[PDB]
């Protein structure tokens, strides 16, 4: 692996085919970002340090509604463009009288999880929620990680213990909410699946395990941790530790729960 | 600052709970951390940088103008400027206009603190600059604006205090040891007050309160701001009793914390 | 023939009103032909 | 209560002109019924004693608009007043953009043969077009429709405005009683 | 409003630059005819270059200095567009990007550069100064706004003459022109502006990284021309062999040998046009003189 | 600026208990206008407010109305504009408690508070409360639904408005004072609010 | 009087004239039918895009109201219902103003509406009818009535007018007054002497501007 | 043919049936025929038809007009073209082709130049071009140069042909010309230097007016080339 | 005391003709604020550049379907300088860079995005447009935006026939003075900036020193930038 | 049936 700027010479060979992060002229082909050059088969390309999150087939993303438009809408993925999510891509509660009242189901600012379908030509990607594990997010809170952070995996919808369950979002976007009776199906009636109403039996140990979840994600975010579930479930059990979940903002907290988690995967 | 109304509904109903459960787990007069910087501006007099916790940021500069204190009323002036955001807008202004009255140069300030004869005395320049802000930054000004004041050093006189303009030392410099003010800003959510309001905190409060302090005690101005307009609703007296006795017993805290040099 | 209500007609076509009102030998202000409006002053 | 002012109590547990507010008294909460308005109580709502805010133009509801812009598949109009259970004018200025606007359809023009209708032939720009609301659609456009006897064209200028006034003596065609020259539009029946 | 550009008109124009043609017939380094007309009153100047056409009003009145520079005149320069230029053009945007800009230039290239001697302007040291003050008036656009403002400028301050004024102390009488004759204004250099349009008849690719550059450099493009160049460059000279000014803000990266190839370039033009402006002068004062005889 | 007649450059400027009168509905091209006039022993003050709306915002999702309140300087131009906007800050927080803005969604409502007499026999402190209300109103004037009669008493630098019988406050606002004062500030200025909320309300019915 | 008038002056618009009356210089640009703005669209008849550049310095609310008089007469001079939904641009830009800006406008705004309607007439744009303009001034003590003053008559004139007449039939009929700017001390019978007067000039003017006119577009079509 | 101006009296009489052609104007208020244009009126002998000759160099879309533009946007059925800088759009529809279905688009992309003719032109309305044979040369214009004209030069060149442009350019080059009543005049040669020398030639001639220097012109630019 | 440029070769600061001043960058200064941040510190200047993109605009018009849209603010803060009170020229500036980094940053490859620019100016003292080029080039490949070239700015002062390389805020106003942005290690010039009078044969001379010291420039700001990222793979592993 | 495009000089 190696280390290139812009500008920089990647290879003189022209019998190469041009991946991203590059540009050439003649036999020259030079490196557009500051990245690793990474050889597949006979793709020469950059692999930059920075970027948004780009969207691939298959993603498990968590993402805000933007706009709502024409017959589609677009969502906030924390890329570089919006991604689509067309009418014909949701499971309703197809009629032309549900194409005007679109904001019944998603309105601007509301929080769904969904599956990238498809990628257009600019690289924006389309979504779809036609199935049960993916919908609007209720029953609990939002927040975000570098996308670096989320490894891609088989699955990305994880119950932890303490009846919480989190939704880490291949975009860096997690939702951290009750574990609901569905939630507990994935081991092995919702008429309103798009209902802003929240389950109104949430605990306050319920409550509070979310704040120590969320705070324990912040953490290993600081430290640039890759999330994993094994790794969220790691630091809540370490994080007992303190008695208050308040005191696990401060700087020296973090490192040290980020240090301890590290460490035993040496010894591990 | 954007939320799904399944966020703000249960956002509220654990923030307004019996206790309150604080999306980050803090008690209600617990700060979030902050970093300080200050001493990088060798062009001022004093300066300041802090770093909020959500990644707001702030930079201060002092300098100072001999002037003569018989025609020069006000000895101290703020410059607001926020990033993202016009010179007249009104967040600008309102702040601008705010902080002018807490350091004020008879209010909050030691206005004979700045003398230096019996004609002519130093002006402040006090200089903001809000490089990012994801709420109400009064608080988070305020602070940066305490750490410059204190690391400002200005020039020691060598002319008579009876009176030509007055001539100072070209090597030797003198501390300024003004006592800066400091401006809390709260959250009002149901029955319950928050010291450090986050953004996500202040986008379903009540209503928030703005409180100053110097030397020890509870100075103005103090306002009643609104951290939002989707539920903004009245507060009952004895919640804005609470908020200034909140301010009263946790600000020393705040100040030594500061105040580790 | 189709008449709308004074209200709508000065907004649906305000030359209208006006021919309307003239027709009848008034004016939309209900003011005479020739008559001023009455001037009241506070000076200094 | 016959009268009612702001923060007026009415009853105990809606309405334009009230709302639900929760009082504490005696140490038990109470949530009554008040007064927003200051007006006459009338279920409860508040009604004072030409206010467009009230009736603002819904789904079934007849409104007298103006066109704006023809376009091959469309007709795009401001709506200016709706029709009440008289009428209800609205007190924005059509300068400035502050009206609500609406769209008409070219298939909802008339009832019969709305495949083939020509735009050009039942609307002009400056035309008083008497519609039915069919959905809110989206924050930009109403949708409207004229598809009955007693909706189209009513009022109307020769010439967009440079000529006299017309008269709906056909339903398809107005003519004007001083020139003689007639033009073809969707009109109303008076 | 936009210019639309037909793609058979950009390649056309393109193609025929390689075959080092121009539309309006010159060569890549010819300057435009500079043809400079002169109205009955001082300061009245019309600059045309082919189809551009600008107008030029010097004017002055009596000021009072900056308490800065007790011993200076005051002089602006107000070059604001009109849609009389073509409707490309909006109403008085003084902050579009290339209003901005092109100002720039005319205020570096005349005020900056000290072409009017504001000494002279100053009538009294403590108060009581001249303000002079160019007014710019674009009337026809056909590309070349830099380099016809410019020379518009010089012409009109050179050809403006300011009334005689006599001072009691305090008491400035300003004389009119029938009581005194006007005196004109101290020049101490002509600045003129040439501008190179460049035009890249390949890709990006090989102008951050060709071996042999291929750019394209033409003098004092056309509208047509100006439209489709992908780089251009103003620079300032005098008959002192002095460099004025030189702005290449953006644009495409040009080789600097190939930049200055083009100043020098240029000062064989501004020759031409500094020598032109001074005989139209004379020759304009030889016809009020001889119209002095006959009154 | 080209847009006025500043006259020349060179000229520079010259250097050198409170019995109310409410009046509604008398200006015509807004939705409610109103006239507050309040002679006191040591200041006499009369300011007319305006409220355009609720006026449809173009492409506005927004559940709720957005409040807009400018106070200007209608010939007296005796404040800086720094405090006018810090005033129209705080009085947007207060109204925008009191009106029911669910019921205005998509739509905004613009309230212009304009100064016409102010004479003094900063001072700002006590201008708020007859600002508060000259809006309610106005507000009323419009048919805008308001949650309570906002009302508010001034006292010693100290602003307190209040709605509910003076249960709850709906805004406060503290420049200099004394210390400790709180207790019997909030009594002296709930005296200003029952005593304009009953003029308000007697207004509005007669 | 004696005018000396252009047409056809520019070449990135659809119209252009200059018209020089006396010292007074004006230089106008016509460009319409073309797509209006947003904010300037008329569902009905077309929109004016009017806009006046002074001699020397930046425009002022002076100009602001030569614009707004301008308009007054060139509206009811263009046909705007033949081209809905479209603007005009008639931009004006005084070169020398003949009198002394400081006090007097009137030979401008006189100026402007002939080199207006001029550039209206190269432009091709549909003119119900025809149009002139006169400055006409009464000088102090002679009391008499000066059609087309001088910038030093001006200087001693009581009261200052511009004159704009509607003609058609040839230039022989006057079909209405388009604009009549008197300003200064006057009383009824000076009026109308002044009114007669300024008919009888502005006859003369349409005459001569049918003259000029016809010069400049006959050479330009076939017979 | 006479010279009118706008406000003149009439020479026709309403006894006559008249077609009204351009520069005529009917009063919708007072139903009088007047004229609004300023240039020679012209009148047929016998069913007359009457209309005013008058300069202009800003199009307005008349049906049954040659006219080339240039596509500026692809919509959902139709494209968008404009047929002089600064005026309104002008739409073509995809249907509006030879052989035309609703399994073949045309190819044509943003910035290709397109003759058409116009077919629905209304005032309240957005025009509209096609490029079909109306009664059964039009298309894309692949390279070539297109030149800037005023519309009188334009239809007389199109329609009088006496009118020598044609003769003389054809005597020195072999060209392809696409004549549009919008002012706009594409020509293409085998080589950029007869182009360009074509291009020259229409550019000069279009300035003088003066039919019998067109000849003179031509010699000369033809000989710079060279 | 001091001297201009001293008989013995020596400068204000002591620094010779062909020497720069004290250059100090950073990278990734705003990870919470912006993609890509720098800190600039060249000499006495302190300047922060913040890179917001690409990203979805704000306003559907004002969109580019073919292209992203690039746009540079620079805030020159008050306590920039020995404090004034009192724009055109600062526009100037903004479109100069946009200009400049139009051609270099691949906006056509960001289609329907928008890339802000935002620049806070906290410390002042000449050669202010030559940093203000570096904290652009090392904020936007921090932001991992694609580019041809790295853009590398200078000042160079003329000083009789003795050029001088990086030129602080009273060289500036004792001599003329060139402002170069150079694309990467070639000799094409981004922008050519002669802001005062210099003689037509001693002009060649001067973009010389200036060519050769931006060079030195780009290789400083490479350095640094391959610092901090061996610096961030060793730590991660 | 006026020729709109046509070849000359064939
Ligand atoms: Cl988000
Ligand atoms: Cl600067």
């Known amino acids: 692996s190696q280390i290139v700027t812009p500008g920089e010479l990647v290879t003189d060979d022209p019998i190469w085919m041009r991946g991203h992060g590059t540009y050439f002229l003649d036999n020259m082909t030079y490196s557009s970002v500051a990245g690793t050059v990474s050889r597949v088969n006979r793709l020469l390309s950059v692999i930059p340090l920075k970027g948004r999150y780009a969207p691939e087939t298959g993603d498990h993303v968590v993402g805000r509604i933007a706009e709502v438009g024409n017959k589609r809408w677009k969502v906030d993925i924390g890329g570089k463009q919006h991604a689509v999510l067309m009418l014909g891509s949701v499971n309703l509660p197809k009629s032309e009288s549900d194409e005007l009242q679109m904001r019944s189901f998603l309105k601007e600012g509301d929080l769904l999880n969904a599956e990238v379908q498809s990628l257009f030509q600019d690289g924006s990607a389309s979504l779809h929620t036609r199935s049960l594990k993916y919908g609007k997010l209720r029953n609990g809170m939002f927040c975000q990680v570098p996308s670096s952070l989320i490894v891609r995996a088989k699955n990305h919808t994880h119950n932890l213990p303490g009846n919480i369950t989190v939704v880490l979002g291949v975009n860096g976007y997690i939702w951290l909410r009750k574990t609901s009776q569905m939630d507990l199906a994935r081991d092995t009636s919702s008429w309103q699946i798009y209902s802003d109403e929240n389950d109104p039996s949430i605990s306050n140990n319920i409550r509070q395990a979310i704040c120590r979840y969320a705070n324990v994600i912040k953490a290993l975010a600081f430290c640039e941790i890759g999330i994993t579930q094994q790794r969220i479930v790691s630091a809540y059990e370490a994080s007992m530790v303190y008695s208050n979940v308040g005191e696990l903002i401060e700087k020296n907290v973090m490192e040290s729960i980020g240090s301890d988690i590290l460490t035993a995967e040496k010894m591990r | 600052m954007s939320l799904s109304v399944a966020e703000k509904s249960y956002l509220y109903d654990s923030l307004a709970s019996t206790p309150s459960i604080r999306p980050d787990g803090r008690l209600p007069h617990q700060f979030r951390p902050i970093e300080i910087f200050t001493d990088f501006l060798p062009s001022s007099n004093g300066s300041s940088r802090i770093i909020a916790s959500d990644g707001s940021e702030c930079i201060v500069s002092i300098k100072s103008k001999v002037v003569d204190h018989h025609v020069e009323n006000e000895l101290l002036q703020v410059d607001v400027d926020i990033a993202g955001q016009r010179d007249d807008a009104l967040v600008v202004e309102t702040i601008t206009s705010l902080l002018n009255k807490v350091l004020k140069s008879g209010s909050g300030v030691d206005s004979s603190k700045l003398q230096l004869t019996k004609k002519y005395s130093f002006k402040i320049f006090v200089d903001v600059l809000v490089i990012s802000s994801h709420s109400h930054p009064i608080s988070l000004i305020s602070f940066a604006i305490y750490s410059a004041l204190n690391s400002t050093y200005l020039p020691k006189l060598i002319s008579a205090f009876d009176d030509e303009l007055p001539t100072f030392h070209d090597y030797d410099m003198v501390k300024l ?27 379903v409060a009540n209503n928030g309160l703005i409180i100053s302090w110097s030397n020890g005690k509870i100075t103005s101005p103090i306002r009643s701001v609104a951290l939002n307009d989707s539920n903004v609703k009245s507060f009952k007296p004895h ?3 609470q908020g200034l006795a909140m301010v009263e017993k946790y600000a020393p805290d705040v100040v030594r914390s500061l105040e580790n040099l | 023939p189709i008449t709308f209500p004074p209200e709508v007609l000065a907004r649906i076509s305000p030359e209208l009103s006006l021919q309307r009102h003239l027709s009848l030998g008034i004016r939309p202000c209900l003011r005479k032909y020739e008559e001023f409006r009455d001037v009241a002053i506070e000076n200094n | 209560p016959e009268i009612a002012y702001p923060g007026k109590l009415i009853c105990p547990q809606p309405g334009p002109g009230t709302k639900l507010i929760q009082y504490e008294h005696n140490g038990r909460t109470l949530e009554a019924i008040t007064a927003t308005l200051v007006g006459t109580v009338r279920l409860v709502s508040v009604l004072p004693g030409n206010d467009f805010a009230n009736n603002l133009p819904k789904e079934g509801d007849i409104v007298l608009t103006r066109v704006t812009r023809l376009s091959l598949q469309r007709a795009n109009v401001e709506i200016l007043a709706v029709e009440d259970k008289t009428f209800s004018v609205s007190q924005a200025s059509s300068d400035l953009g502050e009206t609500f606007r609406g769209i008409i359809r070219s298939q909802d023009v008339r009832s019969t043969d709305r495949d083939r209708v020509k735009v050009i032939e039942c609307f002009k720009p400056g035309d008083i077009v008497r519609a039915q609301v069919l959905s809110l659609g989206d924050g930009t456009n109403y949708y409207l429709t004229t598809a009955r006897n007693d909706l189209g064209v009513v009022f109307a200028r020769a010439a967009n405005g440079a000529g006299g006034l017309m008269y709906a003596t056909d339903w398809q065609m107005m003519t004007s009683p001083v020139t003689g020259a007639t033009e073809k539009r969707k009109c109303a029946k008076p | 409003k936009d210019i639309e550009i037909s793609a058979s008109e950009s390649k056309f124009i393109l193609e025929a630059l390689r075959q080092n043609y121009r539309l309006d017939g010159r060569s890549f380094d010819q300057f435009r005819d500079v043809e400079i007309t002169f109205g009955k009153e001082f300061g009245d100047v019309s600059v045309k270059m082919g189809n551009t056409k600008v107008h030029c009003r010097i004017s002055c009145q009596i000021a009072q200095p900056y308490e800065d520079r007790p011993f200076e005149g005051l002089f602006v320069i107000s070059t604001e567009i009109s849609p009389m230029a073509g409707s490309q053009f909006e109403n008085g945007n003084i902050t579009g990007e290339d209003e901005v800009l092109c100002s720039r230039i005319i205020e570096k290239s005349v005020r900056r550069s000290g072409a009017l001697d504001v000494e002279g302007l100053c009538i009294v040291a403590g108060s009581k100064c001249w303000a002079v003050r160019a007014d710019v008036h674009f009337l026809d656009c056909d590309g070349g706004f830099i380099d016809a403002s410019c020379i518009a400028v010089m012409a009109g301050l050179m050809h403006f003459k300011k009334p005689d004024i006599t001072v009691h102390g305090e008491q400035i009488i300003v004389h009119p022109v029938n009581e005194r004759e006007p005196v004109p204004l101290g020049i101490l250099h002509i600045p003129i502006c040439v501008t190179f349009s460049f035009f890249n008849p390949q890709d990006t690719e090989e102008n951050i990284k060709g071996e042999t550059n291929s750019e394209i450099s033409i003098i004092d493009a056309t509208l047509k021309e100006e439209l489709l160049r992908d780089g251009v460059l103003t620079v300032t000279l005098n008959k002192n062999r002095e460099v004025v000014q030189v702005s290449k803000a953006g644009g495409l990266p040009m080789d600097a040998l190939t930049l200055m190839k083009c100043c020098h370039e240029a000062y064989s033009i501004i020759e031409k046009i500094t020598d032109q402006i001074l005989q139209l002068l004379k020759e304009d004062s030889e016809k009020r003189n001889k119209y002095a005889a006959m009154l | 600026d080209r847009r006025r007649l500043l006259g020349p450059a060179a000229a520079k400027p010259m250097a050198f208990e409170q019995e109310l009168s409410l009046h509604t509905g008398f200006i015509e091209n807004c939705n409610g206008s109103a006239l507050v006039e309040a002679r006191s022993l040591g200041h006499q003050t009369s300011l007319i407010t305006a409220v355009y709306g609720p006026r449809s915002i173009r492409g506005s999702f927004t559940s709720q109305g957005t409040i807009s309140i400018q106070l200007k300087n209608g010939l007296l131009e005796k404040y800086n504009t720094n405090e006018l906007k810090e005033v129209s800050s ?25 100064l016409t007499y102010d004479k003094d026999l900063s001072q700002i402190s006590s201008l708020i409360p007859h600002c508060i209300t000259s809006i309610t109103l106005a507000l009323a004037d419009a048919g805008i639904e308001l949650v309570d009669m906002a009302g508010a008493g001034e006292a010693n630098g100290t602003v307190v408005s209040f709605i509910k019988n003076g249960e709850e406050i709906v805004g406060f606002w503290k420049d200099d004072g004394d210390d400790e004062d709180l207790l019997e500030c909030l009594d002296r200025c709930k005296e200003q609010y029952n005593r304009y909320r009953d003029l308000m309300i007697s207004c509005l019915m007669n | 009087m004696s005018v000396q008038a252009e047409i056809g002056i520019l070449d990135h618009v659809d119209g252009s004239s200059e018209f020089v009356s006396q010292d007074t210089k004006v230089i106008c640009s016509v460009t319409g039918p073309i797509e209006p703005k947003a904010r300037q669209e008329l569902p009905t008849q077309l929109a004016l895009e009017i806009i006046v550049r002074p001699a020397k310095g930046v425009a002022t609310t002076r100009e602001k109201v030569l614009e707004d008089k301008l308009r007054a007469v060139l509206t009811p001079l263009i046909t705007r219902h033949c081209y809905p939904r479209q603007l005009c641009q008639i931009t004006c830009q005084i070169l020398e103003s003949g009198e002394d800006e400081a006090e007097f406008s009137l030979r401008e705004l006189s100026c402007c509406i002939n080199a207006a309607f001029l550039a209206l007439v190269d432009a091709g744009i549909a003119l119900n009818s025809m149009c002139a303009s006169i400055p006409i001034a009464i000088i102090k003590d002679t009391s008499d009535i000066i059609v087309d003053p001088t910038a030093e008559q001006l200087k001693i004139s009581l009261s200052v007018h511009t004159l704009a007449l509607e003609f058609v039939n040839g230039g022989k009929v006057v079909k209405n007054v388009l604009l009549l700017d008197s300003n200064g001390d006057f009383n009824e019978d000076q009026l109308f002497s002044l009114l007669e007067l300024g008919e009888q000039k502005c006859q003369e003017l349409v005459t001569n501007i049918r003259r000029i006119i016809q010069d400049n577009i006959s050479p330009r079509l076939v017979v | 043919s006479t010279f009118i101006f706008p406000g003149d009296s009439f020479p026709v009489d309403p006894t006559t049936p008249v077609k009204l052609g351009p520069g005529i104007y009917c009063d919708p208020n007072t139903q009088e025929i007047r004229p609004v244009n300023t240039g020679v009126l012209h009148v047929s002998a016998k069913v007359q038809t009457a209309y005013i000759d008058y300069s202009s160099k800003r199009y307005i879309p008349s049906v049954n007009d040659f006219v080339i533009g240039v596509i500026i946007g692809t919509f959902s059925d139709s ?10 759009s002008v739409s073509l529809s995809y249907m509006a082709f030879p052989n035309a279905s609703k399994k073949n688009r045309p190819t044509l992309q943003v910035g290709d130049l397109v003759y058409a003719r116009v077919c629905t032109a209304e005032k309240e309305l957005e025009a509209e071009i096609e490029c079909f044979d109306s009664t059964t040369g039009f298309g894309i214009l692949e390279d070539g140069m297109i030149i800037d004209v005023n519309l009188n030069f334009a239809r007389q060149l199109l329609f009088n042909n006496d009118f020598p442009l044609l003769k003389v350019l054809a005597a020195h080059t072999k060209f392809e010309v696409a004549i549009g009543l919008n002012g706009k005049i594409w020509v293409k040669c085998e080589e950029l230097s007869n182009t360009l020398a074509c291009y020259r030639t229409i550019m000069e001639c279009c300035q003088k007016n003066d039919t019998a220097a067109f000849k003179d012109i031509a010699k000369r630019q033809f000989k710079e080339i060279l | 005391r001091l001297e201009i440029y001293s008989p013995e070769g020596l400068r204000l600061d002591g620094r010779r003709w062909n020497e720069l001043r004290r250059f100090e960058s950073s990278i990734n200064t705003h990870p919470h604020a912006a993609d890509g941040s720098s800190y600039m510190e060249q000499g006495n200047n302190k300047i922060i550049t913040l890179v917001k993109g690409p990203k979805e605009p704000r306003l559907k018009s004002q969109m580019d379907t073919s292209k992203a849209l690039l746009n540079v603010s620079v805030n020159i803060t008050k306590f920039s300088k020995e404090r004034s009170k009192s724009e055109r020229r600062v526009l100037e500036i903004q479109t100069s860079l946009v200009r400049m980094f139009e051609k270099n940053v691949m906006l056509n490859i960001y289609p329907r995005t928008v890339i802000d620019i935002e620049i806070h100016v906290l410390e002042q003292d000449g050669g202010i447009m030559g940093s203000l080029i570096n904290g652009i080039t090392l904020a936007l490949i921090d932001a991992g935006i694609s580019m041809f070239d790295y853009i590398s700015g200078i000042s160079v002062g003329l000083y009789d026939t003795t050029p001088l390389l990086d030129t602080n805020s009273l060289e500036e106003n004792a001599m003329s003075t060139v402002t170069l942005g150079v694309v990467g290690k070639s000799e094409k010039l981004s922008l050519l900036l ?42 991660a592993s | 049936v006026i020729s709109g495009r046509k070849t000359f000089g064939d």
Do not use: C, T, W
């Open chain 2, 177 to 203: 040891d003004i006592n800066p003010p400091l401006v809390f800003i709260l959250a009002v959510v149901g029955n319950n007050m928050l010291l450090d309001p986050a953004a996500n905190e202040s986008e």
């Open chain 2, 239 to 241: 919640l804005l009793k």
């Open chain 6, 90 to 114: 705080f009085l947007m927080g207060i109204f925008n408690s009191v009106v029911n803005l669910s019921r205005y969604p998509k739509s905004g409502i613009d309230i212009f508070v304009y």
């Open chain 8, 79 to 88: 494209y968008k073209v404009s047929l002089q800088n600064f005026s309104s």
């Open chain 9, 194 to 235: 002669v802001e005062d009078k210099i003689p037509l044969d001693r002009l060649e001379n001067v973009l010389a020193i200036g060519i050769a010291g931006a060079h030195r420039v780009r290789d400083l700001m490479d350095e640094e930038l391959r610092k901090h990222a061996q610096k961030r793979v060793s730590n």
